[PDB]
Design a protein around this nucleic acid. Structure first.
Length: 769
DNA sequence: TTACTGCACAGGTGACGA
């Protein structure tokens, strides 16, 4: 119940002045509403970088109004490029914003100013450095040396509203891996060329920052490559005359034969840096270094200690102009109620309820384990139990000729034990995986040829693919193409598994004077665990056999997720308790945004199909957007339900609310709870329990969809959800985000960070050609 | 096959810097 945040109060913010002059923009009156705001923030960005001041957008009614810090003297007022030229006309009457007010619509302006100015004292601190604007502040001294690489520890700092009045800071600890020795003056042109698109740390004397390698310079560090006025000058000479005071040796004594890297400014200009002073950023996710990556996962005690250390060390005096500022010693804390997980419905009339006579941790551990054990028990089992329609299992020819048959026997038996009512009995087909080439073309050619001959009877196909890209941070192009083509050209619905994972589960054995494949249980995969998980996710869930659903209504009757990435929009709908659930794809104009018409079409048709199955009059609707929400999207959403309320398909006074689910949060906040201090945990800091939550304002809140009993390591990352429109209170939306995240269908005995709504999108999220 | 913890890559309402 006792919970603490990483929100620190701000002190001395009396006598703080945020002077803006509003302007407004003509441009062309073609408010494309999808091209309009694009250009709005393109110009805001351009001005913020060129003039280096905190330009903001405040969008009232017309949604124009760039806000210009009044302390810039010469202002272009007219701005070129950006399609038709834009004229900036002031709305007179300068603003002088203060931090002791009630809730205004100028709060975005204050937060922008506060963010901008809080990072001058840290930018000036000799012992800190920042990769780039907005990013966290890391110590120059590494936290640790791991062999060839250094582990740097930093803290991110964002301004925010304080729920007990005023403004504060939300911070989080952060990590970065950088190779210890530099690229070096002795590295030749071929080596540097092989580094294009890596990022590196540049120790330009006392000023450290990070940039993306874009090309290799033709001129060496000592050869003339610049102009000082009209005299051609070397990079060495330029770095010398921009050093000051007692400049370090490294910047004034470069090897003249060393090479230089090239990069782009934020304002899009060309610059050089000597390789002698650049240290490659290391990717611990790619080139999968488990031992290194584990160093970045912090216990709650480690996290709290590092965050508070940074606060007390660098945020106790903070001078900005005549301004004296401080960060409170101790973070905001509260007593809160924690949400209980919802009662769930399983097969045969059985309900699972959290037990309230146990302490919250034990009760949550029992409930989570029970989700799996009730799914498996043939006396209770899946909430939705029916026979499957015909099924196909489509295997590569090379697999069918070796270990395919043994895998299929085991998989079929595993499905029948997990879901005894389906009578799973797939027809096994092969495709010629070696006949054409084994890139994405050629695999696709063999899959399509098998589909053309009519060999895939039935509409459900489970297809085993080869893994073309084994590197992480890689989308499965082949799987996306297979789903898209089998849906578009045939009626097929396709789930995917790969060949590497199960193949590691089987070894060839001599039995009865015959070669046979049998299970091997050493290492590389846990084959039983694989068979069970793939049976659940690819066959049961893939045929929409939900193992359990909510017993009680959410605050929302219907709730709809949206994600647009790769010109591939995904709409999702959960209704009743998760008894309805649908998922549609759509080809969007842009890669990551939606036209208002497309929204108001897909949603209307999708919901009209299901409305006769929704046996309660519908009156509250919620949309969960995965990421930023655009107002063309909001307009379409409001229009859909105003129309359906007029018609009578819905309650005449039904309402809509829209919420962005920010999984990477721009203001990352953490929650801690406390136990009795043990010898290992001298302060007794621990994770918050699963249902914990907090709202900072009417528009910003946090739920722990992950938390204490079910996390094995690290500290929980609370989920940030922010309202964008509508009458639903933020607390109610937090509660049923949490209830929707207890529908842990992919892995019943575990916690799950995203609510089921957006969980559907980010797995069905695919590619377009 | 799947769950979280993590960084980064891009990819961003974003100030620096040869």
């Amino acid at each position: 119940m006792t919970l603490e945040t990483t929100l620190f109060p701000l002190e001395g913010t009396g006598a703080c002045g945020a002077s803006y002059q509003l302007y407004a923009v003509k441009g062309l009156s073609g408010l494309d509403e999808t091209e309009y705001h694009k250009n709005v923030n393109l110009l805001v960005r351009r001005l913020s970088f060129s003039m280096k001041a905190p330009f903001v957008a405040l969008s009232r009614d017309g949604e124009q109004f760039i806000a210009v810090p009044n302390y810039v003297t010469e202002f272009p007022v007219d701005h070129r490029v950006v399609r038709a030229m834009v004229k900036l006309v002031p709305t007179g009457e300068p603003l002088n914003l203060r931090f002791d007010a009630a809730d205004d619509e100028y709060d975005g302006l204050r937060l922008r100013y506060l963010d901008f100015v809080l990072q001058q004292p840290l930018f000036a601190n000799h012992h800190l450095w920042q990769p780039g604007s907005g990013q966290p502040f890391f110590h120059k001294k590494p936290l640790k040396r791991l062999d060839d690489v250094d582990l740097y520890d930093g803290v991110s700092v964002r301004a925010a509203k304080h729920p007990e009045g005023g403004f504060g800071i939300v911070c989080d600890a952060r990590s970065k891996f950088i190779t210890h020795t530099p690229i070096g003056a002795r590295a030749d042109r071929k080596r540097l060329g092989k580094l294009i698109n890596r990022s590196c740390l540049y120790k330009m004397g006392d000023h450290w920052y990070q940039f993306r390698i874009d090309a290799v310079s033709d001129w060496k560090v000592g050869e003339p490559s610049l102009f000082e006025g009209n005299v051609p000058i070397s990079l060495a000479q330029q770095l010398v005359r921009t050093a000051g005071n007692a400049a370090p040796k490294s910047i004034i004594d470069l090897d003249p034969e060393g090479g230089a890297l090239e990069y782009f400014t934020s304002t899009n200009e060309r610059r050089m840096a000597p390789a002698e002073l650049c240290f490659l950023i290391e990717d611990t996710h790619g080139r999968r270094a488990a031992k290194l990556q584990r160093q970045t996962i912090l216990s709650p005690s480690e996290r709290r200690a590092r965050v508070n250390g940074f606060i007390r060390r660098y945020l106790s005096e903070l001078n900005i102009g005549g301004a004296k500022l401080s960060a409170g010693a101790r973070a905001h804390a509260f007593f809160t109620e924690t949400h209980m997980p919802p009662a769930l419905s399983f097969g045969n009339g059985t309900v699972l309820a959290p037990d309230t006579s146990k302490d919250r941790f034990q009760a949550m551990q029992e409930y989570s384990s029970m989700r799996r054990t009730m799914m498996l028990d043939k006396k209770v089992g899946f909430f939705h139990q029916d026979v499957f329609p015909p099924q196909t299992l489509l295997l590569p020819e090379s697999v069918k000729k070796s270990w395919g048959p043994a895998f299929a026997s085991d998989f079929v038996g595993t499905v029948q034990e997990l879901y005894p009512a389906g009578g799973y009995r797939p027809e096994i087909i092969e495709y010629r995986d070696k006949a054409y080439g084994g890139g994405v073309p050629g695999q696709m050619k063999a899959l399509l040829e098998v589909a053309e001959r009519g060999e895939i009877k039935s509409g459900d196909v489970l297809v085993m693919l080869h893994r073309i890209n084994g590197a992480p941070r890689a989308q499965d192009k082949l799987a996306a193409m297979v789903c898209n083509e089998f849906e578009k050209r045939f009626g097929k619905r396709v789930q995917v598994i790969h060949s590497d994972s199960p193949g590691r589960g089987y070894k060839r054995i001599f039995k009865n004077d015959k070669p046979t494949y049998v299970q091997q249980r050493g290492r590389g995969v846990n084959i039983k665990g694989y068979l069970k998980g793939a049976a659940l996710n690819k066959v049961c869930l893939g045929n929409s056999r939900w193992p359990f659903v909510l017993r009680d209504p959410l605050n929302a009757d219907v709730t709809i997720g949206i994600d647009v990435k790769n010109n591939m929009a995904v709409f999702t709908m959960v209704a009743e308790g998760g008894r309805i659930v649908r998922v549609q794809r759509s080809r969007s104009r842009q890669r990551e945004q939606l036209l208002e018409s497309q929204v108001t079409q897909v949603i209307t048709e999708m919901l009209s199909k299901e409305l006769p199955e929704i046996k309660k009059q519908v009156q509250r609707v919620v949309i969960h957007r995965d990421g930023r929400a655009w107002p063309a999207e909001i307009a379409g959403a409001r229009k859909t339900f105003a129309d359906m309320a007029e018609s009578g398909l819905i309650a005449v006074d039904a309402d809509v609310s829209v919420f962005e689910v920010l999984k990477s949060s721009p203001a990352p906040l953490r929650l801690f709870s406390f136990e009795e201090p043990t010898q290992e945990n001298p302060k007794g800091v621990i994770n918050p329990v699963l249902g914990s939550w907090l709202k900072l304002s009417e528009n910003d809140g946090y739920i722990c969809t992950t938390g204490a009993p079910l996390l094995l390591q690290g500290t929980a990352d609370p989920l940030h959800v922010r309202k964008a429109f509508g009458p639903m209170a933020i607390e109610d939306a937090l509660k049923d985000v949490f209830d929707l995240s207890c529908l842990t269908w992919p892995k019943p005995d575990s916690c799950m960070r995203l609510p089921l709504t957006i969980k559907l999108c980010d797995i069905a999220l695919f590619d377009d050609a």
